Write a protein that binds this ligand. Structure first.
Ligand code: MG
Ligand code: MG
Ligand code: MG
Ligand code: MG
Lengths: 364, 374, 362, 374
């Protein structure tokens, strides 16, 4: 991309951790350039924030509607917008952006219902604009390594996919942890095993902090994949003592792979009957696709900020290919798009249906 | 001191070809808690006698079968007082029954038997003949398991919310069940030790035979449980967890903190208070509870292993036998060991999981009768 | 700092070193890149600089030309970072200072103590700062260690064991001593500022023979005033090691240990108590260790964050020096740190070249 | 099979008040390699007799002192054949000497003695009376130490460049030395097993007494060594490494790869080939060398501990004794155990480090005479 994509944010204002990483990622390597935004419901502190960031005073709109309409009149108007507002606003804001002919990057989750998600998807195709979803963990290079090893048959036939995102920060929309954290490792499995398809699943959710009912702060999701493989997802915000605990273990007939988000730069490779191995980010034995995004030599620890930059970069590549109508270039870019968004919403929906019905199996 | 005279002991099976006879002997004979004076070591008379004589066992006490041993030993004044059964799982029920009927304390290699009805029969006989029936859930012999029990009882974890268990190795990546009873019940007993008051209300199980030829016996299973009171429990049993050397772990999650133990690192115990720095407790340290230090056989820092745990277990079996022989109920209750009750529950747990699994993972009441329609 | 500092880069063109420098300086718009001498090849330099959005007339052919022409601009650079070969650090830093520009020089300030003394002379004379890239000190937990040690949580310090031994090369006056040994040495400086080296000895080897007389491995034993002992293992031939930079501070009451490959955790081991692991971003950390958090605990930050934090401190020192006032409340690897880094290497080489005899530190 | 009849054994010390007597007995009596038939267990005859009797030792063979035992036992047809000395370090020399002169094989708790001259005397006596002198560098009993030896000999590490050793615990944070001989020599013997052909050319040592009252005995020390051939070696000995439970580690660094072992995790061995994924080898796996599998007492995955290592050690002492009794030199050379030579070298290393440390860390020749001026 010869030039930075004219960008803007909705939300992600003062003291927003989420907004900060979005900006770091998007502006990394000047892939995007923040030229406008609706940073706060509070108009005064919205412009005060936008200006410290160097955003022109007249482009620190009071809301997303005014921003979209006014920007449409500028030859230098925004081309894409990132949404970091509350979950219940995601559907309406993403809908507007698309109708405005803008590329979108929406913070998880896309929306609350499958219907809404399918509506947004029809619009993205109608307006020919991408809708990326922030499954930022997929930006870590080793996730690519796993994908390549599995496709190359290094694990043999896949038998199980054990996932979990269980932290304890809350030991003291249709769901809470299922949508807030469960979907992250679920998307990682999508990247690692793109051909695996869910046939049916059951879920058991609890509200250990009672006042949270009906929203769950803990959940178990058991899945049956077409072909015989099994899947398990443990979602939690009450796993006391856990700093994050997002892990995915893929088990095959020949070996297993295991990745942990708190140790992003190492990937466990366990061949049955052989010594366990630890693969390191940036090493020459890695598949080429797992090396392209390295920003520093192996041994030097990269982090989540790098992963998000890698993710935002792919978003940029997708938008660009979509704009130049370069069918070939778009097919070569893998990113969390509208389909991943739809699936995230559907998985949660199926899980809630099962859980509300005493954990019955439900077709996917 | 407490076992002044070594308990006259015998073994059924565990001969030359046995893969478990060694740990049983090392554990039982340690500190001379038991003394091997007889046995029915082999289905092959000559090989059994050869083996037995190599152990210093009276040639005339190397019986051809468990029945002849029980019958003849019962006529001797210095006849065996206890017997350890290490024969194939299918024989555990009948041998344990014969031993009990013969007035012998029993130590049975898990499982105790295959059905709950058989299990209840052994329990009935055990009470009738006033003889114990220890079951070999030997991982419970590790000191830190007691530490966890003490910590949980002291409210260190606040209210218990989840008990996550697993015993998933991958050696087989290439009765009524396989992994559920072979490995699943080990961590299950560990939870019993750490949380004696927790009662299972109902559970569901999903089991698979990844190596198809094994069906209907499962080489992988997931068990989700609901404890009375709201807590949840999960058990992952597997012999196809490729790359895993054992993988037996248990994590107890409470409202205030969690604790986790892994059998491959038996001398450490993770203690994670939410909002505080994670902690690692070490076997043999002064900050441990006395009940978690009494079994130490060497100073902290030096690693102890499964053999020590098994010796610790057999020692409790001996204490239980002595208290029972003394008709001391209160004393007996002070001995924390996997006895007839744990044996029954281990069989029940497998039976309920199998019932759930055979019925597409529907919820089944842990106790009581489950019905399709009623 | 209301306005970004007008910044330039010498070298670090089409260079991961240049990359992390830029990522760090430009983050949160602490600095703004307006000029540079990116390459020996003007064509490649201009192309590079232009890709970065730098005016073509400000993509200078050499550092002197840049310093000369920029002095004539109201929007001229105020600071310059050097990422050229270690052999050019001295002369370029000297030129920068005489030009009245703040400087950020890559790891080795220079080769000799004389040179280091001269640069310090100039920094004071032109009242400009000279930061050195001991970036690992940017990690928050290093601050945590410093505070814990100062509050006496380790009791009396007895030993300081450091190492930076990787194996990438298993197949100036030194090599690893200056390239990797000085990194954990600076970490100890931040953790134990009051510690003073009395004397030390060093043993160095050239396992890959052709590297002689430069060492690819070295052991440095030190005696601190007060009785504490210090050990430094520098290596590029520790086969199998991805980096292996670690520091363990041992006190009479407890120890703490940090490893650069797991920057977000700090081991705290109180004798007779359960070992503890401190996590970046947690509420039990000292306030000073939390100020630089850019994201919640549990999310792994990395070396890029540490460098960002380092560059912010450089900016703060430059500002305070400019507004002339504040400079005392900002800790950072400056000229003194640079000088000491040079002296430690010089003392180590002297000892090693003389069969590991003890040598007074100063 | 190779020890048809249990070796008539005895202990000097290791009584009820000893904290090392238990591991010696467990190791020696395991598999009936040895049989305890006599002892000089306590300087207090009454307590020694009581103790000994509790072990099945005839009251008449519970001697009041090692001298009496050696003299009386030598006059018995069923007299002891070997003796383990577990008394204070200062007595090792004289007791070992007396045992050897009394025609007894010896197993001495380290160190063998305090001076090289004494160590050479014991070596001379050992050859004269043709009796072995094993030294308890028990950590070498762990299987993975043999694996490392095999890997190094097979060239897995390429050319050895560095040998980094340490044994630094913090239990004491609050003869001629303390930690050098007490813990320093353990990993040193581990390196001897892994790198038998490596020869020390010269070394320097810096030692400190952080708890001043201990001086001149050190509670911390650093030893830097130059091996013949160019490789370097480092040993950190410490009793004041606050927070460390044991901390015994050895990392061997070669031109191609490195390997590392930690006594607190004895069942794993790190294998790091430069440029390749780090590897972790596990005790009991089929990819190990048979010499590293032969001592397995249970399947991999189950953790073995220091007691197994010690039993493995004692078994080798037994094999060495038998080979010596058969006068089979070639057979004796196949038995890899810490014998008199390892004993002498353990004493020499300490003596050289002390000489250097006492002289402000000057380089001292490992072999030969060191001089201020010459
Ligand atoms: Mg019945
Ligand atoms: Mg099925
Ligand atoms: Mg002599
Ligand atoms: Mg001194």
């Amino acid at each position: 991309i010869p030039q930075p994509i004219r960008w803007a944010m909705v939300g992600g204002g003062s003291q927003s951790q989420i907004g900060y990483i979005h900006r770091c990622a998007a502006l990394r390597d000047n892939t995007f350039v923040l030229v406008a935004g609706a940073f706060d419901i509070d108009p005064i502190r919205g412009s005060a924030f936008g200006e410290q960031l160097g955003v022109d005073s007249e482009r620190c709109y009071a809301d997303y509607l005014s921003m979209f309409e006014q920007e449409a009149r500028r030859a230098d108007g925004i081309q894409a917008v990132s949404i970091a507002t509350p979950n219940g606003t995601h559907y309406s804001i993403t809908k507007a952006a698309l109708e405005a002919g803008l590329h979108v990057v929406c913070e998880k989750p896309l929306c609350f219902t499958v219907e809404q998600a399918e509506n947004l998807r029809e619009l993205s195709h109608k307006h020919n604009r991408i809708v990326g979803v922030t499954y930022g963990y997929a930006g870590h290079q080793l996730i690519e390594q796993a994908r390549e090893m599995i496709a190359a048959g290094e694990l043999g036939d896949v038998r199980m996919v054990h996932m979990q995102f269980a932290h304890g920060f809350h030991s003291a929309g249709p769901s809470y942890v299922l949508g807030d954290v469960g979907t992250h490792p679920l998307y990682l499995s999508e990247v690692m095993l793109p051909d695996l398809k869910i046939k049916r699943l059951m879920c058991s959710r609890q509200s250990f902090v009672a006042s949270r009912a009906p929203l769950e702060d803990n959940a178990y999701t058991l899945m049956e994949y077409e072909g015989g493989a099994m899947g398990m997802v443990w979602s939690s915000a009450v796993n006391a003592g856990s700093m994050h605990g997002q892990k995915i273990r893929v088990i095959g007939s020949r070996a297993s792979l295991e990745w942990w988000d708190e140790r992003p730069n190492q990937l466990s490779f366990e061949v049955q009957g052989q010594p366990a191995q630890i693969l390191e980010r940036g090493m020459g034995y890695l598949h080429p696709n797992a090396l392209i995004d390295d920003r520093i030599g192996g041994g030097h620890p990269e982090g989540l900020f790098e992963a998000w930059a890698n993710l935002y970069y792919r978003f940029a590549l997708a938008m660009d290919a979509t704009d130049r109508s370069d069918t070939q270039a778009l097919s070569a870019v893998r990113y969390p798009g509208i389909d991943a968004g739809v699936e995230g919403v559907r998985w949660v929906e199926r899980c809630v249906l099962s859980a509300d019905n005493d954990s019955i199996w439900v077709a996917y």
